[PDB]
């Protein structure tokens, strides 16, 4: 009987570690939420009657 490990092959349903400062790979899901927050943030009121701060 053969399996993915028996032939030094990646499992049919396999996952990679999230990317780090030096190695690539997936991104963490909350990182995806973060970047989707950065683009089109609609975070609060940007200006109130032309006033900020």
């Amino acid at each position: 009987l053969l399996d993915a490990e028996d032939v030094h092959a990646a499992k049919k349903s396999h996952t990679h570690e999230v990317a780090t400062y030096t190695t690539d790979g997936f991104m963490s899901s909350f990182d995806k939420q973060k970047i989707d927050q950065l683009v089109s943030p609609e975070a609060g009121v940007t200006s109130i009657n032309g006033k900020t701060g």
Binding site: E42, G44, V45, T46, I48, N49
Partner: protein
């Protein structure tokens, strides 16, 4: 985050905060409620 359910570029006014304008009129004075003096009452007072 929001003011009165408004987000983003929002301009609020007196009626937006349930407030009265500078040039706003009240209910005229009657026999049961206090208010602005009517024109007829002022004319009658002046004539008397």
């Amino acid at each position: 985050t929001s003011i009165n359910g408004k987000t983003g570029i929002v301009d609020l006014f007196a009626s937006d905060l349930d407030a009265a304008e500078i040039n706003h009129t009240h209910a005229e004075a009657t026999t049961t409620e206090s208010g602005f003096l009517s024109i007829d009452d002022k004319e009658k007072l002046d004539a008397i």
